[PDB]
Every structure is written in C-alpha cells, then in structure tokens.
Design a protein around this ligand. Structure first.
Ligand code: HEM
Ligand code: HEM
Ligand code: HNI
Ligand code: HNI
Lengths: 145, 140, 145, 140
C-alpha cells in the first residue's frame, strides 16, 4: 500500500529501466556482495571473481528473469501474494533460499537504481521503491510463514 | 575484511572528499524517509529537507567513517568513544545500522557511479558492517 | 502446523512449565544476552548488571504476561495471526520493536526450556518448539506485512 | 570482547571437558532436526541418529571452538583454514551459523544447568557470534 504520488514515481522511473541490464546487475551484485547466494547457482560455472559473475551469460539471462517478476508485481500492487505465489513455493519447498536473501536482493536492486539513475533516484523515490521491495520480498516469503 | 577490500574502501572514500558531510546527511535523509521507525532515536532533531541538524549530524557521521577508514585494523579502539554512545547510552537496535549502511551505499552509487563497481560496493557493505558491529560491540 | 506426536510432546512439557518463573527468565535472559532490547524497558528500572535484570520485579511480572501470550498461542496453533492481532498492532504501530527481536525472545525461551528440563528437552521436542516460537514471531510480525 | 566474558567461557568449557565432542554432535543433530535446511550442506553424510560421522564431525566442531577460545584475541588468523572451506568452498549462509550457535547454547543449557547462567549465556553467545564472524570475514 502506497500514495498515488509514490505509484506515479515507481511506474515513471520503471519505464526508463531497459532491457534488462539492471536485472543482471542486481543478480550479479547479490552474488558478489553476498557470496553465499552463489551456492544456489553452482551450475552457472565460474563465479570466482566479481568480473566472472558480471561477465557470466547464465547470470545475465537469469537477471532478465528476476527483474521480469518485479515488473509483473509492479502492475499487481494491491495483490502481491497471488502474483508471486507461483514463485514463492519454488524458492521455499525445495530450492531452500533463506528469506533474508530476499531482502538483500531487494536492497541491491535499490543500489542498482541509484547507480543507473543517479540524482534522479531522489530520496522520496527511494522511499517509494523501499515499500515495493519490502512488499516483493514479503510476497516471495509467504510460503515459509 | 580482505586486503583488497581495504584498498577498495580507501580509494572510494578518498574520492568523496569534503562532500562526505553532504553524503552522510543524504544517507540520514534517506533512512528517515524510507524507514520512518528510525525517527524515534531523534526527537531532539528536525528531519525536514535541507535541515541544519541533519547536515551537522551528517558531518559527525562521515568524519567518524573517515576516522574508521584510516584505522581499518584499529576500529574497536578508534571508534571506542562512539561504541559507548551507540551501545551503552543510545542502545540502538543493530537493525537500524543495517538501514543507515544501506542508505549510505545508495548515496555513494548515486553520486559516484564510476567508483561504485560490484567489487567496490561489496567491500563497502563489508566495511559498514564491521563499523556497525564495533558501534554495537559491547552491551551488558 | 505440527505433527500429532509433536502437539502431544509440546503440551506435555508445557504442562510441567513453572508459569511464575520461566517467563521472567526468558525476558531477563533476552535483556542480558541482547542488551539493546533494554531501550523498550527503561521504565522497569535497574537493568545495569545481569544480576539486577534477573532480580527485577517488573521483568518477572512482565515476563509472566509474555509467557501467558505463548500459552494462548499453543492453545490456538491454527489461529496464531488472530491470537496476536492486538499484540502485532501494539508491537508494530505503538512500540516500534523490530520483528527480529521476536525471533530472539522465542529462541531465548527455547534455551530456558532446555535449561529447566535438561535431557527431558530432547532434539525432536526442541524441533517442535522451534516451529511454535517461529509461528508466534511470524504472527507477532503480521502487521508490517 | 571483555575479559569478564573469558572468566565465563573458559570456565564453561572447564565443565564441558571430554564431553565437548558429545555436545558438538548433539548441537548438529539439534540443528538438522530443528532446521531441515542445514542438511543441504551434508548430502554426502548419514544424518541418522547415532551416526558415527555426525559424532566424529561433532568432535571436529568442538575442538575447533576449544582452539578458538585459546586464540581468542587473534581469532581471524587461527581459524583462517576454516574460513577458507566454509566461505569459499561450501558457501554457507551466515544464518545457518546463528542456528548452530543457538543449538550449541541449547545443548550447554540442557547439560550444564548451574554453569548456564545469564552471564555465561551472554558471554557464550557473543563468543559464538565472533567465531561465526571469523568464518564469514573473507567473502568474495
Ligand atoms: C554508520 C554508523 C554510524 C555512525 C558512524 C554514527 C556516528 C555518530 C556520531 C559521530 C555521532 C555523534 C558523536 C557525539 O555526539 O559524541 C552520532 C550520534 C548519534 N547517532 Fe549515530 N552513527 C551511526 C549510526 C547510527 C544509527 C543507525 C542511529 C539510529 C538509527 C544512530 C543514532 C545516533 C543518535 C541518536 C545520536 C545522537 C544524536 C544527537 O543527539 O546529536 N547512529 N552517531
Ligand atoms: C515474541 C514474543 C513476545 C510476546 C509474546 C510478547 C508479549 C507481550 C505481551 C503479552 C505484552 C503485554 C501487553 C500489555 O502490557 O498490555 C507485551 C508488552 C510489551 N512488549 Fe512484548 N512480547 C514479545 C516480544 C517483545 C520484544 C522482543 C520486545 C522488545 C524487545 C517487547 C517489548 C514489549 C514492551 C515494551 C511492552 C510493554 C507494553 C505495555 O505495557 O503497554 N515484546 N509483550
Ligand atoms: C540467492 C537465491 C535467490 C534469490 C535471493 C532470489 C530472489 C528472487 C526474487 C526477489 C526476491 C525474485 C522476484 C526472483 C525471481 C525468480 N527467481 Ni529467484 N532467487 C534466488 C534463486 C533462484 C534460483 C536458484 C532459481 C532457479 C532454480 C533452479 O532450480 O535452478 C530462481 C529462479 C527465479 C525465477 C525463474 C522461475 C523459473 O525457474 O522459471 C524468477 C522469476 N531463483 N528470485
Ligand atoms: C550448516 C553449515 C555449517 C555451519 C553453520 C558450520 C559451522 C561451523 C562452526 C560454527 C561454530 C564451526 C566451529 C565449524 C567447524 C568445522 N566445520 Ni563447519 N559448518 C557447516 C558446514 C560444514 C561442512 C559441510 C563441513 C565439511 C564436513 C565434511 O567432512 O564433509 C564442515 C567442516 C567443519 C570442520 C572440519 C574441517 C576440517 O576437517 O579441518 C570444522 C572444524 N562444516 N563449522
């Protein structure tokens, strides 16, 4: 739940996000900044150095997948649980990703937005996206709860 | 903390310059707007946009970090005075440090794009974390 | 969401719990082990040394109210969100408590149940109580989500 | 970490003694049963009750803590070989460390009542947070 000014800011800035190098930059930085997340992607090959991760095609392609889900959820703001239900049980039941890593990826995404948009990603715009990423992270952790 | 993480932080904060006081102020500004619960720790303060109290406290926060980068191996002894403030008197929930550490990372990425590389970012998140753990080190 | 045999073990051990002391001990241990949590209890007084926290009459009396809230939760394991509706609102909107502190108190309670029951508190018994204290924390965190 | 904590941790392991390997094995079983996710790091292991390999692996975790309590002041260099396999090879989530520390505290609580006091509890949890911080200090 958020104000229409937040709804406008979150959608206007997401319209500038292309196509996507942001998805790969976020998944990449999660594997770099928090290396324990690499275990879930052991079949992606080399992830030994930050460059190996950023230059990984399997990471880049999977990056496109994760950011695509965010875009889907950004339309279905009012119902985040039903939208991410088909993905919550995946990560929960047998993939076994600790729900803290959901909040880490959300925050890393927010860092990528600040990196790519700069001064455009103003503090009230960050605040709006925070409510969104907390939402997505909670929606992807409903199956554990 | 790694030797490579030590140079990565030293290079990135060496490029913040005297505008560190503004980056700290921005980070605070961000934390208050993004996580309004963190405002309980500041009743004596005015947290509106462009406030002198936020700019002054931002300077206090950033200078403490400049003191931390210089004493990368001497952190529990150099930031001892502040560990007494944050852990003994303020008793700030360690979660709040995670929120400010995040907001600072956002500020750095926004103002310094060429510097904010996945390798630099990782070293800073590690740096801020070991700074955070010192300021919340001894509680009894 | 527990096994029939788990519910038998949980209720059996709980019926042997000293309602007068176990509560105050869990709250006391929380304030000694994690002393940032003392910011929510400065009205209680003497919390300087570990001996003062454990002796504190308000920590003991309040601990008793807290243990009561766990008992309620155990009685209605299938309606935890509902059992802690006013409390989730109180702890979230009124008190500011971070949801991670609920997870810590629950874990300190498990330590207290191990300290009082010894070898009677076997690993499958703890396994069943982890599901409970995780349930209570999640339900007590429902108002943010 | 205060030397007041040391007069509790060292004294606590003084009542542990030979039962170290025994308590380490119980903590791992407590962890596997209470948190079935931690099992992912052990598919090449027999996780059944009374398994000699969990018992043997328990002894290893136990002496590693005895080695850590000895070299308390300079813990990163002492457990660097451990920091190399957990962080780099196995890629263990830091949460799983909090889980083993909790289970280790539950074991000590269940076996040493007069010895598991609020002071020792706080001192052991701090020490366990530190030991698990050392096996998380080198992440790239
Ligand atoms: C990056 C980590 C942090 C650093 C380096 C930092 C640094 C400082 C410094 C240098 C001071 C002033 C020193 C003095 O007055 O003697 C200060 C004060 C304070 N800090 Fe922190 N701080 C940090 C994080 C936090 C967080 C996360 C909170 C709460 C959410 C917080 C709350 C306070 C408060 C309430 C004061 C006193 C403010 C005043 O009355 O002037 N700090 N901090
Ligand atoms: C997770 C298990 C917890 C349970 C079951 C629980 C339960 C309760 C209950 C039943 C009360 C009584 C409400 C009243 O006085 O009317 C209470 C009050 C309170 N709780 Fe919690 N609590 C828990 C965790 C926490 C934690 C972790 C903190 C802080 C670190 C906390 C801080 C407080 C405070 C400050 C009050 C006083 C409320 C008042 O008297 O107005 N609680 N809690
Ligand atoms: C660190 C682990 C991790 C995190 C934090 C994470 C966080 C997220 C978040 C935000 C919280 C979202 C929206 C998201 C979205 C997706 N993930 Ni996640 N994923 C993670 C590990 C995976 C893995 C692993 C897969 C593939 C599963 C497999 O068996 O290969 C995955 C697959 C996906 C898919 C593709 C579905 C499919 O298999 O067809 C999407 C979409 N995801 N993941
Ligand atoms: C759940 C994951 C996990 C955690 C939290 C964890 C936590 C700890 C802690 C925390 C206090 C300590 C002191 C510790 C110590 C050890 N671990 Ni850990 N280990 C873990 C997974 C392992 C695995 C996996 C191995 C390899 C065992 C084997 O033989 O295959 C391991 C091996 C060891 C060894 C043996 C290495 C050797 O032979 O030199 C020691 C000692 N450890 N581990």
């Amino acid at each position: 739940h958020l104000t229409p000014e937040e709804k406008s800011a979150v959608t206007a800035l997401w319209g500038k996000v292309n196509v996507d190098e942001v998805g790969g930059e976020a998944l990449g930085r999660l594997l770099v900044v928090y290396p324990w997340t690499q275990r879930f992607f052991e079949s992606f090959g080399d992830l030994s150095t930050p460059d190996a991760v950023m230059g990984n095609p399997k990471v880049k392609a999977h990056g496109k997948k994760v950011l695509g889900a965010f875009s889907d959820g950004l339309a279905h703001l009012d119902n985040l649980k039903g939208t991410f239900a088909t993905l919550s049980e995946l990560h929960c039941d047998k993939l076994h990703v600790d729900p803290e890593n959901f909040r880490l990826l959300g925050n890393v995404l927010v860092c990528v937005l600040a990196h790519h948009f700069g001064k455009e990603f103003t503090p009230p715009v960050q605040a709006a996206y925070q409510k969104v990423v907390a939402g997505v992270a909670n929606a992807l952790a409903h199956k554990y709860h | 903390l790694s030797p490579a993480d030590k140079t990565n932080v030293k290079a990135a904060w060496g490029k913040v310059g005297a505008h560190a006081g503004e980056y700290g102020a921005e980070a605070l500004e961000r934390m208050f707007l993004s996580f309004p619960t963190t405002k309980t720790y500041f009743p004596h303060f005015d947290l509106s946009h462009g406030s002198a109290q936020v700019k002054g406290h931002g300077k206090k926060v950033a200078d403490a970090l400049t003191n931390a980068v210089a004493h990368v191996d001497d952190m529990p002894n150099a930031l001892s005075a502040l560990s007494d403030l944050h852990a003994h008197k303020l008793r700030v929930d360690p979660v709040n440090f995670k929120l400010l550490s995040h907001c600072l990372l956002v500020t750095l990425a926004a103002h310094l794009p060429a510097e904010f590389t996945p390798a630099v970012h990782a070293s800073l998140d590690k740096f801020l974390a070991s700074v955070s753990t010192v300021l919340t080190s001894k509680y009894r």
